[PDB]
């Protein structure tokens, strides 16, 4: 099943303060007003492609999604990035430590790290084998679809793991829904206000008026 990206999937392209400027950059972004997938957060959590990078979101009552796996095979035949939450930290491993092959839990050490109503949004991209994570959380204003209006995702993590990725999957803690779309190389115009803050954007390739 499908829905639409609207203005979502914007994030700060670097840790630099710019202010009172309509700055521009070319980077991976989620294309504006583009078609994206939607799923229930149950059982409906299959293997997916990753492509160059992912926009992920989920609408959840008490956070039911508690991890993700990224890699070529996702199956502990080779090191594959496992991202997890333990209710006090984010926990990250690349190990052949196999989670349930039916992808939920009812409640090799070559790299490791530790730090509907809730909408969580995440953006993921891999550059030089390093994995970069951006995110934002909000209360919902729509019960099933994605929010139409603007918000910029914040930087969370950048880990120099050195790993190839082509696929991913999401993992559930049980006794909600999620959305997936892919980034493309795009030129964007970014509305930095006085407060160091991107307040709006234009996807320059969206339409002839955007050009």
């Amino acid at each position: 099943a499908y829905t639409n990206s609207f203005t979502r999937g914007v994030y700060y392209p670097d840790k630099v303060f710019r202010s009172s400027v309509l700055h521009s950059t070319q980077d991976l972004f989620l294309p504006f007003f583009s078609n994206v997938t939607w799923f229930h957060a149950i059982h409906a959590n299959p293997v997916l492609p990753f492509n160059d990078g992912v926009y992920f979101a989920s609408t959840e009552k008490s956070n039911i999604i508690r991890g993700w796996i990224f890699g070529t095979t996702l199956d502990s035949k080779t090191q594959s990035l496992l991202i997890v939450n333990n209710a006090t930290n984010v926990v990250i491993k690349v190990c052949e430590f196999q989670f349930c092959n039916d992808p939920f839990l009812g409640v090799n050490c070559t790299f490791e790290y530790v730090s509907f109503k809730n909408l969580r949004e995440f953006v993921f991209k891999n550059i030089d084998g390093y994995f970069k994570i951006y995110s934002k959380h909000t209360p919902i204003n729509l019960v099933r679809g994605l929010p139409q209006g603007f918000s910029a995702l914040e930087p969370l993590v950048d880990l120099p793991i050195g790993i190839n990725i082509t696929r991913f999957q999401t993992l559930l803690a049980l006794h909600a829904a999620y959305y997936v779309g892919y980034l493309q190389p795009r030129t964007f115009l970014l509305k930095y206000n006085e407060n160091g803050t991107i307040t709006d954007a234009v996807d320059c390739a969206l339409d002839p008026l955007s050009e």
Binding site: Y12, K15, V16, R18, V21, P160, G162, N195
Partner: protein
């Protein structure tokens, strides 16, 4: 002024000589509050590295090192750098360094350079075209070469596709190019994916083994974690200084500010794409890197045929920030302010003009637009002239400038 104009005579005028800048009183060094020694010396003493298709990496962070001894050291048979000079490394800091290492024949050490191609660069260890880093290597024939051959070092001879920059790929899957089915064994057009160097002590100095280390530097928007062997100063504020934040360097006032850097932001920029502010990595405060508080200097003078006396306008500078007068154009020094107004002699700006007047001094005044007159108008009165004067007015116009010609071959070459 005489030097700006390249002459000993200066006519009555205002001349744009120079530019006032508040000078850097002292240098200021702001590395992170870190100690420890980086493990490069551990890598330089390792018992072996991996076969090059499986090349090792060590991440370097939270530490300092002296690089200057390394390119002087008799321990190394080759040292190179790209995007950095080895001479400059002791002055720098990095967000990370990665030391990448392997053993290969000396004839293949040439592939450890930016944007290369061939079986190492394509199928074992790719460096990008714009690689910022250094390379260290030593002939290891004394450690790594043996009678009949040391076969324990190998390289990928073949792959289906070329590696991305820093892609690591350890699986030795058979190189089936032809119809000959792989089935986990060698065949014609289905070759073994590796080869062994088999290093023998009879090998020539290029075909001999070399141990290699690649120093992959990065300095990012994210702050430094690695540095050269230089200590921080304490901070200085609201005075001009020659600053150094992790190698981000220049001349300027470290101005106290409330510039609203979001919690993740580390540096800020002017629209020229040059730094206007930084977070101090020890104080964790948003220092605006104000420049030398600059302002153009303009020199007001009567002709040197009249006097050596002179006045100075610091354009856009306030007189508290450089007799003295605050014009709207900038601070004016050496000119006597006057409440009378006169015809404009030397123009300054914003309605001010200056002149040489009484014992003489340069005066400065708001210019007079003309003699004030009220016309004696009323609804039934007319003035009619009873007489005339025949004026003769001289009007002067240019018509034709000098007909030059320049022969471009005789000018450029001759």
């Amino acid at each position: 002024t005489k030097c700006t104009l390249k002459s000993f005579t200066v006519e009555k005028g205002i001349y744009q000589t120079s530019n006032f800048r508040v000078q850097p009183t002292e240098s200021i060094v702001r590395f992170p509050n870190i100690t420890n020694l980086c493990p490069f010396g551990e890598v330089f003493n390792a018992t072996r590295f991996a076969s090059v298709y499986a090349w090792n990496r060590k991440r370097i962070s939270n530490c300092v090192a002296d690089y200057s001894v390394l390119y002087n050291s008799a321990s190394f048979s080759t040292f190179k750098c790209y995007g950095v000079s080895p001479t400059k490394l002791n002055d720098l800091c990095f967000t990370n360094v990665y030391a990448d290492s392997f053993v290969i024949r000396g004839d293949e050490v040439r592939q450890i350079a930016p944007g290369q191609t061939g079986n190492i660069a394509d199928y074992n260890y790719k460096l990008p075209d714009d690689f910022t880093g250094c390379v260290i290597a030593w002939n290891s024939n004394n450690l790594d070469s043996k009678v009949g051959g040391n076969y324990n070092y190998l390289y990928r001879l073949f792959r289906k596709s070329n590696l991305k920059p820093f892609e690591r790929d350890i699986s030795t899957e058979i190189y089936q190019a032809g119809s000959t089915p792989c089935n986990g064994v060698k065949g014609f057009n289905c070759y073994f994916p590796l080869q062994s160097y088999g290093f023998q002590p009879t090998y020539g100095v290029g075909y001999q083994p070399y141990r290699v280390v690649v120093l992959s530097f990065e300095l990012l928007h994210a702050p430094a974690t690695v540095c050269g062997p230089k200590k921080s100063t304490n901070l200085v504020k609201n005075k001009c200084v020659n600053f150094n934040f992790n190698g981000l360097t220049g001349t300027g006032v470290l101005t106290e500010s409330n510039k609203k850097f979001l919690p993740f932001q580390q540096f800020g920029r002017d629209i020229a794409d040059t730094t206007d502010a930084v977070r101090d990595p020890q104080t964790l405060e948003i220092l605006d890197i104000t420049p030398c508080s600059f302002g153009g200097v303009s020199v007001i003078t009567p002709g040197t045929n009249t006097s050596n006396q002179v006045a100075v306008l610091y354009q856009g500078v306030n007189c508290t920030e450089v007799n003295v007068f605050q014009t709207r154009a900038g601070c004016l020094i050496g000119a006597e302010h006057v409440n009378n107004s006169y015809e404009c002699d030397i123009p300054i700006g914003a309605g001010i003009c200056a002149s040489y007047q009484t014992s003489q001094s340069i005066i400065a005044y708001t210019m007079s637009l003309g003699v004030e007159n009220s016309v004696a108008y009323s609804n039934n009165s007319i003035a009619i002239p009873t007489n005339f004067t025949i004026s003769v007015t001289t009007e002067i116009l240019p018509v034709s400038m000098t007909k030059t010609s320049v022969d471009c071959t005789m000018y450029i070459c001759g």
